[PDB]
Amino acid sequence: RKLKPKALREMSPEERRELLNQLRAELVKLQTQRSRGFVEKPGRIRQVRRMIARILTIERELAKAGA
Amino acid sequence: MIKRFVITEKALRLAERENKITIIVERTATKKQIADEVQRLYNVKVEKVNTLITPRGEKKAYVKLAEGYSAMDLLTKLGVL
Amino acid sequence: ARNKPLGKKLRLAAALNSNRNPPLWVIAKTKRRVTRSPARRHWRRQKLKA
Amino acid sequence: PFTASAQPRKQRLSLYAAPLHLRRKLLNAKLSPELQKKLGVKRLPVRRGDTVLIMRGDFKGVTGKVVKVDLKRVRIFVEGATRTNSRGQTVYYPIHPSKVMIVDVDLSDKARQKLIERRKR
RNA sequence: UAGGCAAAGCCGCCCGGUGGAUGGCUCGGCUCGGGCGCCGAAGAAGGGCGUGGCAAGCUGCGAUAAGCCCGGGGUAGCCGCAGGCAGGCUUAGAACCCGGGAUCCCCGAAUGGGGCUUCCUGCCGGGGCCGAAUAGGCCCCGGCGCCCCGUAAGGGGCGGGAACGCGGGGAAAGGAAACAUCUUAGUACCCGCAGGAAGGGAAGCCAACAGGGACCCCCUGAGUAGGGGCGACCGAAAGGGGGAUAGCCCAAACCAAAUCCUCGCGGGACAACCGUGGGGAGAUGUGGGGCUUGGGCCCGGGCAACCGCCGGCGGGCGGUAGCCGAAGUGGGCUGGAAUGCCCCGCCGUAGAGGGUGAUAGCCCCGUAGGCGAAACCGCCCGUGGCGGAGUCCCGGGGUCCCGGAGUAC
RNA sequence: CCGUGAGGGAAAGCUGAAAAGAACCCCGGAAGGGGGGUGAAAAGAGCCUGAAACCGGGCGGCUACAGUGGGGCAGGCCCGAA
RNA sequence: UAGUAGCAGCGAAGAGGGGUGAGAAGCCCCUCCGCCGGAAAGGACCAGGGUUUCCUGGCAACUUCAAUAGGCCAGGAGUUAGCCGGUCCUAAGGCGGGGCCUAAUAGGCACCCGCCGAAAGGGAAACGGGUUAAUAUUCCCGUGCCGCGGGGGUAGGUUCUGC
RNA sequence: GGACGGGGAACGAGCCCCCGCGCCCGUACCGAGAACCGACGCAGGUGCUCCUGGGUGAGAAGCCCAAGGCGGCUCGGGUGAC
Ligand SMILES: [Mg+2]
Ligand SMILES: [Mg+2]
Ligand SMILES: [Mg+2]
Ligand SMILES: [Mg+2]
Ligand SMILES: [Mg+2]
Ligand SMILES: [Mg+2]
Ligand SMILES: [Mg+2]
Ligand SMILES: [Mg+2]
Ligand SMILES: [Mg+2]
Ligand SMILES: [Mg+2]
Ligand SMILES: [Mg+2]
Ligand SMILES: [Mg+2]
Ligand SMILES: [Mg+2]
Ligand SMILES: [Mg+2]
Ligand SMILES: [Mg+2]
Ligand SMILES: [Mg+2]
Ligand SMILES: [Mg+2]
Ligand SMILES: [Mg+2]
Ligand SMILES: [Mg+2]
Ligand SMILES: [Mg+2]
Ligand SMILES: [Mg+2]
Ligand SMILES: [Mg+2]
Ligand SMILES: [Mg+2]
Ligand SMILES: [Mg+2]
Ligand SMILES: [Mg+2]
Ligand SMILES: [Mg+2]
Ligand SMILES: [Mg+2]
Ligand SMILES: [Mg+2]
Ligand SMILES: [Mg+2]
Ligand SMILES: [Mg+2]
Ligand SMILES: [Mg+2]
Ligand SMILES: [Mg+2]
């Protein structure tokens, strides 16, 4: 289902960056639909945003851990 | 920095007739940053950028692509149309 | 005015964004308890001190 | 954690302002005598999938499965305690958990078994 | 002649419309008691703007934006006020609560410089982009406030907080049946400065020949003495009873660098400190000594010496979520529905109180009572590490030296 | 929300046990009305109770040759179940 | 009071036919009639206002009457710059740091230093045509200009100076 | 902008061709007998602030008419006493 923080930690940095890029692109497409008044899956924008926040949180933790 | 695309009647007309994409960006983005972001994200060439701040406080950029890249094709590829 | 400073323009933008009544589904959700907004105003009557 | 005050205003404010983890305690219902000897506990919070017997109200004596629990309202919906609206749809009467007796327990959840061992002791 | 018999209009009752009184209700207020008590350059409080799929306000949050991570509690539901339409999240353990983290736009002490618009802009260093270019330009990130301490590295102050506290400046109205001395009042208010309390505090005291024994606060002395157009009015103190209890240091006499700070290296419970080397302070005196039971100075005797620095380890208790906790949902009646009525039972260390389709000890929450913490915080106890110039106790000798200045007056 | 500003500052609570929130038929341009439903009760979302002033309708008494309100006595018409 | 006053006065006003619509003196179209025309009226535009702009739909409320209209209501959209302004400069003046004064400050300012101070002063450089429902010296076409930097050529220079 | 001087290099322009770069903010609309202020869609005030064709005429006067706009200084009809 949705990607848990445990699975995100085991990823290499390259896969996390690529996942982050896909989500930001998907968010851009979804916010365009929201401005047009019709969203295909009305509950999806919220999950994409929190997923982006999850990745950025683990990114900061991993950097601090080595710091 | 890009928040969304503008797909209104005016924006679509400018895409077909003038090879321009219309985007909403963060209000503090400059024309230099807007051009860099579009080139990096979408692998196109930007000819010039015109910007304005809407009465609702959002920054809108009319981004003209160079003469080898199609604004209509890019919107279709992104799936925002 | 024609020549605006941006700081004033952004306060005008905020007032424009907030000037609207609650959506119709809010009226339904609250059983008609919430029908008005304090930010609702008319440009001719309630003046911003922008 | 529910006030200790004897003042009705503070007792009621505790009840209406209780957070979700406290509202669970208001879902407790008495177990049937048969379940009491099998499990060794007297009360359990009602859960979707349990089978309850309604002891009060218009649907008194009706036994059915719990289909939905509303923590915010502290009400449960029970199969059989229904009626139809003017458009013909089937709607459920919201029943307070203190008015039902649990006659069958849904024990497929490992986390629920921990609660039982705590109360059996 | 009066009735059938009636205009517009009047009075009364009923019904309706309008209105929102009354009554009942209460997640709000108010008063009193107890606790607890500072936040900020590690960028606060406050403000602006933004943030939800449909979201205007409030609430929360900050471009990671009604939220992200870890742990504990809590198990099956959840997506705030807020009862809608969708779509999701969650048994790979969510929501929720508690602890710890992450993110934290612009303005703000605001601190590079400006600021007639919460926005604009400079230099230097690094980076990116446009570009043929190493030019030029544009963009991003960091540093750049004032006054100070310090050899330097480095460090400090600034702003906020409902009231309370300390220093200063400082009225009038009114009262006196006018009014000026006076009072109101060292009040209102203003300026400055602190703490979780502040201020005060260890006899150049009070007393009266008898004795008390730092201070603050409470009760009293007492509206007494006393001040005062001796008018209005103002107004102690000692003493007594209580709360609580605690005593010390700097300078100087004498000795004269035995001293402190900082950094590197080795050791040392992550400390103090020890060893060594460099730097700073220091004879315009660091340090030792000394504090009314005066001291310095000289002689002798004695350890129960005396004085100080660190807060590691073990143990206990408490706070910040929670868990357990007795006994009817028995027969009949009324009723839409019983917690009511009649009859029959039961618990009680629990009949405080609340909820539940009307009024419930036994339906549920709770109550009497008992238990509990991965993490963070607080208090207590035991134990441990270390430093000083004998500085501690007792006796004798002294009659030499010291004992606070624009002060006392 | 008011004042340039220092400052100043309201009104406003209650469906029901449960939305069972009023299907369906007729009329209306529509707000809506009639019929018919839900409920113990319309309590109908303009939502508990629903007073008076006030306005409409009904009923009783008077009403165009007789100057007004209050009290007593006598009478007419009307009510007089508890 | 009362279905009463007012909805007159300040030198313009309507009418016919058609359409839309449940409904039209009043909305839309044509015709006739009138008023302004160095302007209570046409062209431009500052401050102030802040979305009132444009499109679609609507009529419970709002407009001294009506309404199918609307600056109203609901939903959607719209403001594009090296050369137009700000930005730069200083004016009358102002603020901050230092200093001096002050019981003190958030109070004063002759002095030193810096900065601010004009969308009518000074001051780099863009014009015409076309386009949109709504922007137009901003978009598009054509033809240019300014500043800064670079490449090539040329004049010139290479002790010394251009004719 | 010019001149008058001082210093430096061996190259090199104010001329011709050619290349590159030009950030940030404003920009809708009213601008008033209904978009500003005056509690108002107010005969006031702000701003007639700047600009305006023809005939007559001394005239930027008045009167009449263009370009352009208006009939929205947002009640209509009948009567023809005081
Ligand atoms: Mg622009
Ligand atoms: Mg106005
Ligand atoms: Mg009559
Ligand atoms: Mg804040
Ligand atoms: Mg600043
Ligand atoms: Mg302070
Ligand atoms: Mg007084
Ligand atoms: Mg007097
Ligand atoms: Mg007097
Ligand atoms: Mg104290
Ligand atoms: Mg003290
Ligand atoms: Mg006094
Ligand atoms: Mg010394
Ligand atoms: Mg319990
Ligand atoms: Mg119990
Ligand atoms: Mg009522
Ligand atoms: Mg009788
Ligand atoms: Mg009249
Ligand atoms: Mg005329
Ligand atoms: Mg007219
Ligand atoms: Mg004319
Ligand atoms: Mg004229
Ligand atoms: Mg004009
Ligand atoms: Mg319009
Ligand atoms: Mg329209
Ligand atoms: Mg509107
Ligand atoms: Mg300036
Ligand atoms: Mg236009
Ligand atoms: Mg314009
Ligand atoms: Mg008018
Ligand atoms: Mg014309
Ligand atoms: Mg008339």
From Swiss-Prot, chain C:
Sequence segments annotated as region (Disordered): 31-50
Keywords: Ribonucleoprotein, Ribosomal protein
A GO MF label: structural constituent of ribosome
Record-level GO cellular component terms: ribonucleoprotein complex; ribosome
One GO BP annotation of this record: translation
Homology family: Belongs to the eukaryotic ribosomal protein eL39 family.
HAMAP family attached to this UniProt entry: Ribosomal_eL39
NCBIfam families named among the record's database cross-references: PRK01242.1
Protein name: Large ribosomal subunit protein eL39
From Swiss-Prot, chain D:
SUPFAM superfamilies: Translation proteins SH3-like domain
Signal sequence segment: none
GO biological process: translation
MF terms in GO: rRNA binding; structural constituent of ribosome
PROSITE patterns per record: RIBOSOMAL_L24
One Pfam entry name: Ribosomal_L26
Presence of keyword Ribonucleoprotein: yes
GO cellular component: large ribosomal subunit
Keywords for this protein: Ribonucleoprotein, Ribosomal protein, RNA-binding, rRNA-binding
Function comment: One of two assembly initiator proteins, it binds directly to the 5'-end of the 23S rRNA, where it nucleates assembly of the 50S subunit.
Protein name per its UniProtKB record: Large ribosomal subunit protein uL24
High-level lineage: Archaea, Thermoproteota, Thermoprotei, Thermoproteales, Thermoproteaceae
